[PDB]
Amino acid sequence: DAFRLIDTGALINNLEPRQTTSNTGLLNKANIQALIHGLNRHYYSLNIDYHKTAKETKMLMNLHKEQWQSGLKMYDYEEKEESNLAATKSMVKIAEQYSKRIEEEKELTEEELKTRYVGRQDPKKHLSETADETLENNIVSVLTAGVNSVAIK
Amino acid sequence: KTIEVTAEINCFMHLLVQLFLWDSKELEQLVEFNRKVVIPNLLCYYNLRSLNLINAKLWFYIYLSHETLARSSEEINSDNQNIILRSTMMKFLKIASLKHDNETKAMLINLILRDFLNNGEVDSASDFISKLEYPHTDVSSSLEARYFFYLSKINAIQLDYSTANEYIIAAIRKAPHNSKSLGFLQQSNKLHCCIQLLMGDIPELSFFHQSNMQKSLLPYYHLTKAVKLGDLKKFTSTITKYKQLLLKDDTYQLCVRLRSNVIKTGIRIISLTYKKISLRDICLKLNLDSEQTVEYMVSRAIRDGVIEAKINHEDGFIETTELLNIYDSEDPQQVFDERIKFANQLHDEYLVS
Amino acid sequence: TTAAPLLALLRENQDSVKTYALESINNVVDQLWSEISNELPDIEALYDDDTFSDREMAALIASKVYYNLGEYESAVKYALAAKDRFDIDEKSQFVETIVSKSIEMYVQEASKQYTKDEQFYTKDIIDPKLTSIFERMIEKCLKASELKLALGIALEGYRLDIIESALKSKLDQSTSENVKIINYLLTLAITTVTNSKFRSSILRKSFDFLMNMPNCDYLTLNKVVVNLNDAGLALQLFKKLKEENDEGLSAQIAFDLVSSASQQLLEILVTELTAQGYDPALLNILSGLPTCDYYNTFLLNNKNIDIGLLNKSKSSLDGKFSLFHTAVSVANGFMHAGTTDNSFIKANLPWLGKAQNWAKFTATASLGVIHKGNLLEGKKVMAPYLPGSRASSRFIKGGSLYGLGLIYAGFGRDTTDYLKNIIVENSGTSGDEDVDVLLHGASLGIGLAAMGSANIEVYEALKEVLYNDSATSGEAAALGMGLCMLGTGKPEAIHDMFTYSQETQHGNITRGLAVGLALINYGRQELADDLITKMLASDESLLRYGGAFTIALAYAGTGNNSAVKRLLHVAVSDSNDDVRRAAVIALGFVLLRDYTTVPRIVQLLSKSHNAHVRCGTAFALGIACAGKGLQSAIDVLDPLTKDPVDFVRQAAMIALSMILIQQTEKLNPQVADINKNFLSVITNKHQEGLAKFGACVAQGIMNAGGRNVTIQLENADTGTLDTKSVVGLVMFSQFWYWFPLAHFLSLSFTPTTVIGIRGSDQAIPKFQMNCYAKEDAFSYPRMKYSSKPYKVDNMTRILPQQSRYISFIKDDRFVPVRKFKGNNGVVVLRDREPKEPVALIETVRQMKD
Amino acid sequence: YFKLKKLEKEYELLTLQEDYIKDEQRHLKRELKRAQEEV
Amino acid sequence: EQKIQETELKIRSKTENVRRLEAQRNALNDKVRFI
């Protein structure tokens, strides 16, 4: 947030509002919606952007990802993920156990194929829970398994 | 002139229903009359909406009756109408541009393959297989099972049950029509069991018991116990009594191939588990047929992939192995690439869905 | 039945036995070839034997095996070497296959050798066995009495001998048949082949057929000169008029050359004419003096402003600061364009008083579009604000200079030197803001007046203003230089304008350079790829913003598969909303020729999670489809009107205005809710600013020019791409970026009129052709050929598309030449009997001429 | 023959469109992943 | 003469591949718009 005074003057100049999403006041809603017209004074209409040089943009792209394991990904998370792989194998089995039990009760209670059920989208939610979760658990056991050994000699 | 020819064919296809199994007219003039109403540019230049309007599905069971004890009656070498038919059949495929042709390409090959099944050589049919293979999208579900039926039968004469395995699986799952589930399915199930005859498994009767009548259950049940127990005497008596059923289905060749499988299957039935098997114990087992053939009998069965053994003539025994191991390094990795290959057939479902 | 007994003699001796054997084998190959395919190694081995003279028999037998194998290339090579079994006269499925197989093969082999040499068809580079096929195929096409099949094969064969030989000998001229057949060769040349050198030969060789004038057509030949812009073809047209003296033909040809050609080619015909001799009647023709008068006089006779919709739009509210007066001032200049109507300024005192500097800068400069077309009294309107007539304020004085360039644009060679001393006088130092505003209007005025003409002084004068790093007048310097640099341009200005962008960092200057670097490259196509690569490699979003327009203008017209792929690649990888919007807008300039694929590309982009993706797809669909058909493009803009985003509604409504011009009255029945939402959004104060201002701009475009003139881009009038129309749309693509650029749209308006004049002296008679068609003249927003007469065919609204249903009767004193040419710009039907009772009524342009 | 040559050009423009749809398909999943990380 | 008619019938097979990619994206990009 910012503030800038206007009072008398500041007119007979270039176009302040036309820049970014100004000329507003549908209902009272803008920003914090405690403002409407006056805001602090006159609706200075802040515009917040950012610009950086070629050196600054090159940094945060490669530097900032999640945390720093970088420069070698092989052995840093290898021992940590492999040690919990025995427990992960047992935890992913429970997720599959509750998968088909939802789809089994889904088609068992519907003999109609109409909507009295306020079920407007029933299947896609539970279908994605059995898909996206399955799609999440298998890819982390494959893509990581390729670099989990890579021993050669 | 496409509409004028199509309008005349609409009245011609109605007559062909009578010419098929219903009203055969004359056994001489009709086969000469049906030829002159086709050749004069009914297939034309392939202009538009040209398919299914030819004879196609209708003439499969027609010309086979005129050739056997009707026009010929073994008085000539081959039907002159069929000789011209083979000229028109192979000309239809020669002029084909391989554009919209899907169902019409696979139906004509069914004649040249079926002819080689009764009277003819099937060695030349292997060259047509390279031309026969196309992704046909217009073949109806009734003819998809027949297209897979002939491809599985040719490989049986070629002594390959592995290639014919994939074709016969999709053959019994298709053709829901009642006529195809009675006469065509029972004939196809006997060919599906014929693949198991060359494999050496020969499973028991579970699904096939109620799927077909007792006509096909009697010979398969007697051949099941004959090949499993390794008895050539009971296997010989089965061929004699059931010979009438073996000739019509072209299954009479089982007197050689399946007879050799009587010994190969009986090897896994009897227990060779112990290492050193004396020559006298082999002669006693498998009745007296295993007494005459001892060293040569085991020698070929090892290379064929049945078992793995070693023969010692010095002390007169044979060291045998039951193929039992424990997964350590390279043992479990053999099926690793196979299970991935098994899923490759299911990887095409992404484009289908 | 079996080929085994026939194939056994193939490996034996005594080739005389093989003579009768191969004759018996060749008949059964169509059947048993599957078995013969295993003997192919034995067949090809005996072919190379010199003592074996039957090789011609094995050539056809081996070819039929590969015929059904799926590879037709092997069967062609074996049949041609024997030079017997290949017969074009024999008609069969097998023989016609190997004859037609060499068609695309001759095209594929010639296209690869076309890059190294274009004369390859005169040498042995192509296989003579394959060359004879292309020669014998044309001989069969000539016997079929069809010139479309023969010329269609020779078009893809990259051979110039067959195209000229087969066409010239067939000329029996009916006189109407072979003038049309030439049109097929010229239409399929530039629109298909992307190479300019290949199509140049087709354009030049087609001119020699009409040289002797066997009742030729000069219209098609004029379009050829515009495409190549060659001085040889331009001077050749005047060479025929030098020996053959006709006042009707020499004047009518010059009327097309001045309208169709651009500003660069127009100046070439004027200078080069004096050396070979000139006609004093044609000196004023190429000067464009009557063209400016036909624009104003047309709108005076038939005039409907419809002020009821304009007065109601501006009477809703006096608020919205100065944006409300600026929004209505944009639509004010459109409706009164060419009308020279001051009723807005004179009759209303208050609305002008509440405006600010730049709001009055818009209203004062709006008179330039209003008075556009007047080459005499247009300056007297700006008289009080002149440099030395002082002004009411120095801010408004800068608006008189921009409006001065709007009227004289392209004719301002005298105004260019008038505005040159103003820029140099203020180029020394500027300490205030207003001194840049006065210099701003001078730079935009000299740029439009000199637009289309290369001037080194304007490029040098604006360089000093740009060097001062001015945020107001410096931006117009970069945009003003690009207008004089239009056309091929110079490589020196490419590196200087590009390096200055990365040296001094300014947004409006870079946008002025980015648009400037896009204007300096026109029709260069692959020649501009050097500058395009530098824009794509830079990470700056300002350079990549204008990089799409560089590809749009250079690749405009004939498109490139690689150039379109580059524009689609920028909108994907880059996350900038303004760049993704500017990338898809550039796709419209390349697709201007074929508008069928325009709605299909933007259809997938019409549904997206980003709001700015739908923004650029609205205008790019409306750029080409404005003056064209395909009302299905309106259905794409329908859901954009319900988008809560205000700028998307502004994007849809403005695009609906240009496409629906003269489309109203039950043709496309979307005008009920479209014309209602114009006054509905303005009346309701609950809407946003961008949605309300878009209804004002779209309302003025439908009424632009008094609902008479239309926006014409790639039509039959010019026949090619309009330079002033494309540049006006590029500037029109910026709304909230700096200040409203919609004033540049005045260059895209053209009058639609049918006037015969005479064959000697200017007349403008009033008559009627009396032809029945659908009535588009009396169809206007309110507050089938029966060969039947019509009320009045003179001027009114008409339409270029519906004109083709209006013929020209010969019962009058005028004799038609092309039988209803149909171009409203050139017009001037030939008059064989001047001074006849045609009821001539002189117009108002005769006073100043 | 003029209409037949025009139909050939129509499918040539769709050739680049088929490969371009796969470009947005893999690019949208990168933006869809960022939307899931925001949730 | 043949390849004029041959190309016409062969380019019709590419129409089915276009509808497969359009229906695949409509079921995807529309879901992202709702998110």
From Swiss-Prot, chain A:
- Which GO annotations describe the biological process of this protein? mitochondrial fission; peroxisome fission; proteasome assembly; proteasome storage granule assembly; proteasome-mediated ubiquitin-dependent protein catabolic process; protein deubiquitination
Its EC number(s): 3.4.19.12
User: Under the cellular component aspect of Gene Ontology, which terms does the record hold?
Assistant: cytosol; mitochondrion; nucleus; proteasome complex; proteasome regulatory particle, lid subcomplex; proteasome storage granule
Q: Tell me the protein family, please.
A: Belongs to the peptidase M67A family.
Subunit structure and binding partners = Component of the lid subcomplex of the 19S proteasome regulatory particle complex (also named PA700 complex). The 26S proteasome consists of a 20S proteasome core and two 19S regulatory subunits. Interacts directly with RPN8 and STS1.
Provide the function of this protein.
Component of the lid subcomplex of the 26S proteasome, a multiprotein complex involved in the ATP-dependent degradation of ubiquitinated proteins. RPN11 is the only catalytically active member of the lid and serves as the essential deubiquitinase of the proteasome.
- The protein here is known as Ubiquitin carboxyl-terminal hydrolase RPN11
Protein's organism: Saccharomyces cerevisiae (strain ATCC 204508 / S288c) (Baker's yeast)
The record lists the lineage as: Eukaryota, Fungi, Dikarya, Ascomycota, Saccharomycotina
Q: Which residues of the full protein are shown?
A: 154 to 306 of 306
Swiss-Prot record, chain B:
**Chain segments annotated as transmembrane:** none
Q: Which residues carry this modification: Phosphoserine?
A: S329
Task: Provide the alphabetized UniProt keywords.
Answer: Acetylation, Phosphoprotein, Proteasome
GO process terms (BP):
proteasome-mediated ubiquitin-dependent protein catabolic process; regulation of protein catabolic process; ubiquitin-dependent protein catabolic process
Q: Which residues form the PCI domain?
A: 145-325
**Any GO CC annotation of this UniProt entry:** proteasome regulatory particle, lid subcomplex
PTMs per UniProt: N-acetylated by NAT1.
Presence of the UniProt keyword Phosphoprotein in the record: yes
Show the GO MF annotations.
enzyme regulator activity
Q: Does the keyword Phosphoprotein apply?
A: yes
Subunit notes for this chain?
The 26S proteasome is composed of a core protease, known as the 20S proteasome, capped at one or both ends by the 19S regulatory complex (RC). The RC is composed of at least 18 different subunits in two subcomplexes, the base and the lid, which form the portions proximal and distal to the 20S proteolytic core, respectively.
One further remark on this entry is:
Present with 16700 molecules/cell in log phase SD medium.
Please give the function described in this protein's UniProt entry.
Acts as a regulatory subunit of the 26S proteasome which is involved in the ATP-dependent degradation of ubiquitinated proteins.
**Family of the protein in this entry:** Belongs to the proteasome subunit S3 family.
Protein name from the UniProt record: 26S proteasome regulatory subunit RPN3
Of the parent protein, the shown chain spans 126 to 478 of 523
Curated annotation (Swiss-Prot), chain C:
Is the keyword Transferase in the record?
no
- GO BP of this protein: proteasome assembly; proteasome-mediated ubiquitin-dependent protein catabolic process; regulation of protein catabolic process; ubiquitin-dependent protein catabolic process
Which of UniProt's keywords are assigned here?
Acetylation, Phosphoprotein, Proteasome, Repeat
Asked if Metal-binding is a keyword of the record, the answer is: no
Please give the Pfam families that the UniProt record associates with this protein. Answer: HEAT_2, PC_rep, RPN2_C, RPN2_N
Question: Any idea which GO molecular function terms this record carries?
Answer: enzyme regulator activity; ubiquitin protein ligase binding
Transmembrane regions: none
Question: What are the ranges of the PC repeats?
Answer: 362-395, 399-436, 441-475, 476-510, 512-545, 546-581, 582-614, 616-650, 651-688, 694-730
Describe PTMs of this protein. Answer: N-acetylated by NAT1.
Report the superkingdom from the record. Answer: Eukaryota
Q: Which GO terms describe its cellular component?
A: nucleus; proteasome complex; proteasome regulatory particle, base subcomplex; proteasome storage granule
Tell me more from the record: Present with 4750 molecules/cell in log phase SD medium.
Question: What role does it play?
Answer: Acts as a regulatory subunit of the 26S proteasome which is involved in the ATP-dependent degradation of ubiquitinated proteins.
Q: How does it assemble?
A: Interacts with UBR1.
Cite the PANTHER family for this sequence: 26S PROTEASOME NON-ATPASE REGULATORY SUBUNIT, 26S PROTEASOME NON-ATPASE REGULATORY SUBUNIT 1
Q: Which family does it belong to?
A: Belongs to the proteasome subunit S1 family.
Q: What is this protein called?
A: 26S proteasome regulatory subunit RPN2
From Swiss-Prot, chain D:
**How is this chain modified after translation?**
N-acetylated by NAT3.
Superkingdom, natural source: Eukaryota
Localization per Swiss-Prot or TrEMBL = Cytoplasm; Nucleus
Q: Which family does it belong to?
A: Belongs to the AAA ATPase family.
Role summary: The 26S proteasome is involved in the ATP-dependent degradation of ubiquitinated proteins. The regulatory (or ATPase) complex confers ATP dependency and substrate specificity to the 26S complex.
Output this protein's name: 26S proteasome regulatory subunit 6B homolog
Q: Which organism is this entry from?
A: Saccharomyces cerevisiae (strain ATCC 204508 / S288c) (Baker's yeast)
